[PDB]
Amino acid sequence: HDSANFIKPTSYLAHYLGYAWVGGNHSQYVGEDMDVTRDGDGWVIRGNNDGGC
Amino acid sequence: AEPVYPDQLRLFSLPVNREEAQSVKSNIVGMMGQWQISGLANGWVIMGPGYNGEIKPGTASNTWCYPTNPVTGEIPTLSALDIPDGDEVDVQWRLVHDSANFIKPTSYLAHYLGYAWVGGNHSQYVGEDMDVTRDGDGWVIRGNNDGGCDGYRCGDKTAIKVSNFAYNLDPDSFKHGDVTQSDRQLVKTVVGWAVNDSDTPQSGYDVTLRYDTATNWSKTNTYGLSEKVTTKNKFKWPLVGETELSIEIAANQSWASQNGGSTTTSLSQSVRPTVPARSKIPVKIELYKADISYPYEFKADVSYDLTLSGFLRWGGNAWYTHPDNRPNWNHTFVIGPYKDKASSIRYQWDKRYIPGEVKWWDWNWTIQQNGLSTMQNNLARVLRPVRAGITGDFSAESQFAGNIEIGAPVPL
C-alpha cells in the first residue's frame, strides 16, 4: 500500500518494458488510480476500471 | 499507508483519503443508502450502492471522516482463574459448572454470533436455565427444555460442547511415584564372561542383545488386453494320410500399479565392563514384556476445544455470507495457543481491517450490532487463562522392561 516507494516504481517498470494500459480510468498518468487487493497468499495491483475509457 | 478500522469511521453532514477508502471500500459502501453520494478528502467523492461504489473526483454535501487519535480495539488480557486441585475429570467438572466465569460468557458469544435460542424455558434471559451433562470424554451445555415454549422452532436449542483438554506443565513441578509391573513374560536372556589376562585394565568388551518386530501391507491393480488370429486347413500328406493343420499367432499387453507401506519397532541393550588386570567379570542381560503403571502430579495451564452447534437466526447473524435460510451450523474454536486461522478468535479479530481475510465470522458486524467495548469485554472473559494442580495415574499394556548387570571381579 506504499505509493511512492512501491506502487509507482513498479508501474513504471511495466510501462517501460512495453505493457499496455498501466493505470486506472480516473487519471491520464502511469501508476495513478491503482486498486490493491488480497488474493489467496499474494496481492494484486491493477488500475481501476469502474468508469468508462 | 496506515490500517483503517471500519468501526472508527464517522459520517457527518456539516476526512478519509482515496487510498484509505479503497482498502476498506466494501465497509464504507455497505454503510450507505442506494443512490447516495458522500465526499472524501482532497476533491474526491465515494458513491454508494447503485453506482457500484465508484470513487471519482467531485464534490458532495456530506463527508466521510476518521478520527484524530484512533484506537486499535485489541482484546484485553485478564488475570488467571484458579481451580482447586484434583485429577483431570474433577478439574473439568469445576470449570464447566461455573456460571459467572464460564456458562454466561460462552452463551453470550454464541448469541452475539447469531445462534438461535441460547437459553432454557424458565427464563427470558441469555445463558439462564442451562443444563450441564457428561457425555463420553466431553461435556455438553444446553438450555433446559422440560416445560413449554413460544417461538418459531423454540424447541431447537443451541448446544455448547467442551472437549480435548490439554496441559502446559510448569517445568519444575512434575513428579512421579513408584513404577510397578505385572503380567511379565520373558522374551530372551544372555549370560557371559569378560576375561583379562593382560597386565593392564581393559575396557574393550561388548555384549549386545536386540529384538525387532514389524508389520506391512500392499495393494495392486492390473489391467490388460489380448489379440489372436488362427487358421485351419486340411491336407493329404504322405504315409499319414489326411491331416488337419492349424496355425495360431497371438499378442498381449498388460499394465500394473502398486502401493504399500510398513512399520518397525526395535529395542536393544548392551553391557561394556571395565575389567582389572589378571581378573574376570560375569555379565547378564534380560528382556521382558510387561504391563506398566505409576502415579504422577504437576501444576499447569488448562486449554480446550469449544464447539458451537445450532441454527443461525433469520434476522441476522455474523457468518460472512449472511445466510437467511436458517441452516444448521457447527464451528469449533481453540481456547488456548494458536493452531490454525479458522479456529483462532484473536487472529480473526486482529485482521478485521483486511477484507480478503474475512473467510469465517464477520467481527465488524458484531461490533456494529453490540458496541466495541461490549465485544471486547465478552471476548476477554471467554479467553481468560485457567490454572490448576493435577494428580493422576498412568497405565499401559505390553510395554518393554529390562535389566543389565555387571558383577564382582574374580582374581585369576
Curated annotation (Swiss-Prot), chain B:
<dbReference type="GO" id="GO:0042802">
    <property type="term" value="F:identical protein binding"/>
</dbReference>
<feature type="site" description="Important for heptamerization">
    <location>
        <position position="341"/>
    </location>
</feature>
<dbReference type="InterPro" id="IPR005831">
    <property type="entry name" value="Aerolysin/haemolysin_CS"/>
</dbReference>
<keyword id="KW-1134">Transmembrane beta strand</keyword>
<dbReference type="InterPro" id="IPR005830">
    <property type="entry name" value="Aerolysn"/>
</dbReference>
<feature type="region of interest" description="Interaction with host N-linked glycan">
    <location>
        <begin position="35"/>
        <end position="51"/>
    </location>
</feature>
<keyword id="KW-0800">Toxin</keyword>
<dbReference type="InterPro" id="IPR005138">
    <property type="entry name" value="APT_dom"/>
</dbReference>
<dbReference type="GO" id="GO:0001897">
    <property type="term" value="P:symbiont-mediated cytolysis of host cell"/>
</dbReference>
<comment type="similarity">
    <text>Belongs to the aerolysin family.</text>
</comment>
<keyword id="KW-1043">Host membrane</keyword>
<dbReference type="InterPro" id="IPR016187">
    <property type="entry name" value="CTDL_fold"/>
</dbReference>
<comment type="function">
    <text>Secreted, cytolytic toxin that forms pores in host membranes after proteolytic removal of a C-terminal propeptide, leading to destruction of the membrane permeability barrier and host cell death. The pores are formed by transmembrane beta-strands and are approximately 3 nm in diameter.</text>
</comment>
<dbReference type="GO" id="GO:0016020">
    <property type="term" value="C:membrane"/>
</dbReference>
<dbReference type="InterPro" id="IPR037015">
    <property type="entry name" value="APT_N_sf"/>
</dbReference>
<keyword id="KW-0843">Virulence</keyword>
<feature type="region of interest" description="Part of the transmembrane beta-barrel after proteolytic activation of the toxin and insertion into the host membrane">
    <location>
        <begin position="223"/>
        <end position="255"/>
    </location>
</feature>
<keyword id="KW-0964">Secreted</keyword>
<dbReference type="Pfam" id="PF03440">
    <property type="entry name" value="APT"/>
</dbReference>
<dbReference type="GO" id="GO:0005576">
    <property type="term" value="C:extracellular region"/>
</dbReference>
<feature type="region of interest" description="Interaction with glycans from host GPI-anchor">
    <location>
        <begin position="313"/>
        <end position="322"/>
    </location>
</feature>
<feature type="site" description="Important for heptamerization">
    <location>
        <position position="357"/>
    </location>
</feature>
<keyword id="KW-1015">Disulfide bond</keyword>
<keyword id="KW-0472">Membrane</keyword>
<protein>
    <recommendedName>
        <fullName>Aerolysin</fullName>
    </recommendedName>
</protein>
<dbReference type="InterPro" id="IPR055267">
    <property type="entry name" value="Aerolysin-like_C"/>
</dbReference>
<dbReference type="GO" id="GO:0020002">
    <property type="term" value="C:host cell plasma membrane"/>
</dbReference>
<feature type="disulfide bond">
    <location>
        <begin position="149"/>
        <end position="154"/>
    </location>
</feature>
<keyword id="KW-0812">Transmembrane</keyword>
<feature type="site" description="Important for oligomerization">
    <location>
        <position position="122"/>
    </location>
</feature>
<dbReference type="GO" id="GO:0090729">
    <property type="term" value="F:toxin activity"/>
</dbReference>
<keyword id="KW-0732">Signal</keyword>
<keyword id="KW-1032">Host cell membrane</keyword>
<dbReference type="Pfam" id="PF01117">
    <property type="entry name" value="Aerolysin"/>
</dbReference>
<comment type="subunit">
    <text>Homodimer in solution; homoheptamer in the host membrane. After binding to GPI-anchored proteins in target membranes and proteolytic removal of the C-terminal propeptide, the protein assembles into a heptameric pre-pore complex. A further conformation change leads to insertion into the host membrane.</text>
</comment>
